[PDB]
């Protein structure tokens, strides 16, 4: 409890490594020649090109950060929007970016998880939202997105995965153990109290819950891309970065930037965007 709140990072640090839109999650490098913060916006379209959004409709973003992927649905495909943040920071951000669009359309920004969220909505974004999708419950969680949804329902997450330790012993124990290590680090000092899902239970959970779950999608190769350019960003900004923490915390994201890159590299991590498609999906 009090000894999570010890990894507790201002959201200043994370500026000096994240591109300007701040985004804290995979970016999407296509074409393969885009600027991080480019291919942050293709990463967005990426997610909602998958949702058969409508005008009018109602998209839900679960864990909507600073609200770029909800504006950038409100702007492409002229829907309402509701976001989800545990964040109060992100919350105030949010609004002002809702309220800052020129539309009619509803815009809504809710201090709370999923777990509470009981309305009505068209189609569900997630990516990487650690807080809402980092702590299991993935029964309920797949039961109230299947629930709230119409009978065309659709909707995208994406988040960072492991592999069950089964199949990481198939690449030898040396490096089973090492990664299992690494995982234990990510989840006590990058994402505390957190629980890394694999591929197997994002897609098993949502065919329990009624969902139809086409191939996933992995980001490996981009993931790769965006820590190289995170921990680039971060070792350039070192004194800065130092400054508005210390030592201690510029260690530990340089050990989380080049750790990652080095485990997606060798194909230990990787990265998910998972489509569940409700029974009555647009074909
Ligand atoms: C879902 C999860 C769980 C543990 C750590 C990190 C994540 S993430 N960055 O939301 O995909």
């Avoid at 770029?68 to 409100?74: L, P």
């Avoid at 090492?178 to 989840?187: L, N």
């Avoid at 086409?214 to 800065?240: A, C, F, M, V």
Wanted: hydrophobic letters at 35%; one cysteine or more; proline letters at 5%.
């Amino acid at each position: 409890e009090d000894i999570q709140a010890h990894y507790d990072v201002s959201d200043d640090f994370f500026a000096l490594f994240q591109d300007p839109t701040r985004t804290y999650s995979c970016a999407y490098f296509e074409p393969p020649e885009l600027t991080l913060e480019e291919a942050q916006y293709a990463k967005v379209d990426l997610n909602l090109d998958k949702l058969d959004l409508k005008p009018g409709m109602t998209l839900l973003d679960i864990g909507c950060g600073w609200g770029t992927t909800m504006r950038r649905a409100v702007e492409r495909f002229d829907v309402n929007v509701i976001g989800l943040t545990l964040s109060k920071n992100q919350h105030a951000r949010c609004e002002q970016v809702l309220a800052s669009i020129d539309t009619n359309r509803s815009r809504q920004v809710l201090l709370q998880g999923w777990e509470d969220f009981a309305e009505p909505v068209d189609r569900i974004v997630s990516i990487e939202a650690f807080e809402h999708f980092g702590h299991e419950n993935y029964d309920d969680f797949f039961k109230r997105c299947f629930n709230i949804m119409p009978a065309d329902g659709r909707m995208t997450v994406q988040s960072s995965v492991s592999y069950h330790p089964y199949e990481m012993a198939a690449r030898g124990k040396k490096l089973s153990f090492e990664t299992a290590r690494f995982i234990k680090f990510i989840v006590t000092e990058i994402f505390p109290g957190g629980r890394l899902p694999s591929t197997e239970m994002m897609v098993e959970h949502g065919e329990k819950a009624g969902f139809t779950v086409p191939e996933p999608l992995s980001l490996r190769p981009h993931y790769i891309k965006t820590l190289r350019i995170w921990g680039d960003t971060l070792q350039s900004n070192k004194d800065k970065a130092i400054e508005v923490t210390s030592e201690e915390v510029y260690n530990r994201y340089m050990k989380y930037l080049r750790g990652c890159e080095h485990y997606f590299t060798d194909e230990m991590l990787d990265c998910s965007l998972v489509t569940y498609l409700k029974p009555g999906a647009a074909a």
